[PDB]
């Protein structure tokens, strides 16, 4: 069993009450207060991200794990956190987001953050059946967690099948969620894909400990398997601390306002 695949068994053996304490222990979390007011009051201009995803992407872009440029395609865009953040960035010219939508799946939110005129999101789109289109930057943030690691595995491999046909079109900047990176079939697929399109895996500290998500990003490199194990070790280390402490809070990204040419 991989170290992740021990962390999962452990995770599942936790009481509802220990679960709650653990999921946010020592993680980075952002101050979303003002964002749900804007949300209540429909303030589309306050600069408040529509979701937690904006901060996660910003963590990876600021460290040059991905450098969005040209036309961005955002698969699984949900409310649009990644799309609106990308729209603020200088290299970016056009952002095309796609998301399933429907009941129980997030609908895109219309906002007037900086570069919003550059954003087009289409809900009602199941990306597993959408044909690929040219792009310079590929995002994908899809992966429904699950107590079963085999379910998470099949979900992950299906995503990594779908993404390959987009990467075949040339974008050299990408950022793709890997929900279940500790399963062997997923590690094997990533090495194959890494041989073909490069990049490597990074653990965003804003992720909750209740999931092992990692992001295959074009600006990382190095051994896929060991990067996975290193994060596995962190998550296990946090399950075994005796004094809990809570998350480390930080301010959210301000996405500003206004149109871009
Ligand atoms: N087959 C699918 N096709 C399109 N969207 C999907 C599909 N499966 C799941 N999704 C959506 O993918 C989105 C995943 C979210 N984590 C995206 C959040 C987004 N990155 C943000 O920052 O706001 C969910 O909103 C799903 O509804």
Half-sphere exposure of 198 (CA within 13 A, CB side): 10
Strands annotated E in 109-172:
119-123, 137-140
In a domain, 257, yes or no: no
DSSP-assigned beta bridge partners for residue 176: 140, 216
149, 155, 160, 161 alpha-carbon torsion, rounded to 10° = 130
Q: Using most ligand atoms within 8 A of CB, pick from 68, 105, 119, 122 the residue to mutate for ligand 1.
A: 105
Q: Are 253 and 58 in contact (CB under 8 A)?
A: yes
As for how many domains the chain has, the answer is 1
C-alpha 80/C-alpha 67 separation (Å) is 18
In a domain, 258, yes or no: no
- CATH number, residue 194: 3.40.50.150
In a domain, 225, yes or no: yes
In a domain, 26, yes or no: yes
Distance 53 CA to ligand 1 centre (A): 11
The three-state secondary structure class of 209 is coil
Catalytic status, residue 37:
no
C-alpha 210/C-alpha 25 separation (Å) is 10
Is 142 labeled as ligand-binding?
yes
Q: What are the structure tokens assigned to 255, written together?
A: 């996405």
C-alpha 237/C-alpha 50 separation (Å) is 32
The three-state secondary structure class of 214 is strand
Q: What are the structure tokens assigned to 206, written together?
A: 């804003």
Nearest CA to ligand 1 atom 12: 76
54, 251, 48, 32 alpha-carbon torsion, rounded to 10° = 90
Where residue 27 falls (left for φ over 0; alpha for ψ -120 to 50; beta otherwise) is: beta
DSSP 26: T
- Residue 41 φ/ψ, nearest 5 degrees: -85, 5
* CA dihedral for 78, 81, 82, 87, sign (positive or negative): positive
Is 4 labeled as ligand-binding?
no
Rounded to 5, what percent of the chain is helix, strand, coil? 40, 15, 45
Which entry of 8, 25, 56, 153 is annotated as an active-site residue? 56
Nearest CA to ligand 1 atom 23: 81
Distance 243 CA to ligand 1 centre (A): 35
Q: Are 29 and 236 in contact (CB under 8 A)?
A: no
Is 126 labeled as ligand-binding?
yes
- Residue 140 φ/ψ, nearest 5 degrees: -155, 125
Domain that holds residue 48: 3-251
Q: Which of 258, 257, 261, 250 is nearest to 62 (CA)?
A: 250
In a domain, 120, yes or no: yes
In a domain, 38, yes or no: yes
Give the method used: X-ray
Nearest CA to ligand 1 atom 16: 141
Distance 124 CA to ligand 1 centre (A): 11
In a domain, 256, yes or no: no
The three-state secondary structure class of 256 is coil
Q: Are 160 and 186 in contact (CB under 8 A)?
A: yes
Instruction: List all residues whose CB is within 6 A of at least one atom of ligand 1.
Output: 51, 53-54, 76-82, 98-100, 105-106, 125-128, 141-142
C-alpha 175/C-alpha 198 separation (Å) is 12
- Residue 249 φ/ψ, nearest 5 degrees: -85, 150
C-alpha 236/C-alpha 230 separation (Å) is 10
Q: What are the structure tokens assigned to 120, written together?
A: 């087009």
In a domain, 205, yes or no: yes
Q: What are the structure tokens assigned to 72, written together?
A: 């961005």
Q: Are 126 and 98 in contact (CB under 8 A)?
A: no
């Amino acid at each position: 069993r991989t170290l992740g695949e021990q962390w999962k068994e452990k995770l599942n053996g936790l009481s509802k009450e220990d679960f709650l304490k653990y999921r946010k222990e020592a993680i980075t979390e952002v101050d979303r207060s003002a964002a749900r007011k804007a949300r209540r009051d429909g303030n589309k201009t306050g600069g408040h991200p529509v979701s937690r995803g904006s901060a996660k992407l910003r963590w990876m872009v600021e460290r040059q794990f991905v450098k969005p440029i040209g036309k961005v395609v955002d698969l699984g865009c949900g409310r649009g956190g990644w799309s609106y953040y990308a729209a603020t960035l200088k290299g970016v010219q056009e952002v095309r987001g796609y998301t399933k939508g429907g009941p129980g799946h997030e609908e895109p939110m219309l906002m007037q953050s900086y570069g919003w005129n550059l954003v087009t999101m289409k809900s009602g789109v199941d990306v597993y059946y959408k044909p690929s289109e040219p792009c310079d930057t590929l995002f994908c943030d899809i992966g429904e967690s699950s107590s079963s690691a085999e379910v998470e595995e099949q979900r992950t491999l299906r995503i990594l099948e779908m993404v390959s046909d987009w990467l075949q079109r040339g974008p050299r900047e990408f950022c793709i969620k890997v929900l279940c990176p500790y399963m062997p079939r997923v590690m094997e697929r990533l090495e194959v894909l890494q041989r073909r399109y490069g990049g490597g895996l990074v653990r965003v500290p804003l992720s909750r400990n209740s999931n092992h998500e990692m992001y295959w990003v074009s600006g990382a490199a190095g051994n896929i398997v060991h990067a996975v194990n290193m994060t596995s070790q962190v998550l296990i280390g946090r399950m075994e601390k005796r004094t809990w402490h809570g998350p480390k809070y930080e301010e959210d990204v301000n996405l500003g306002s206004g149109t871009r040419a």
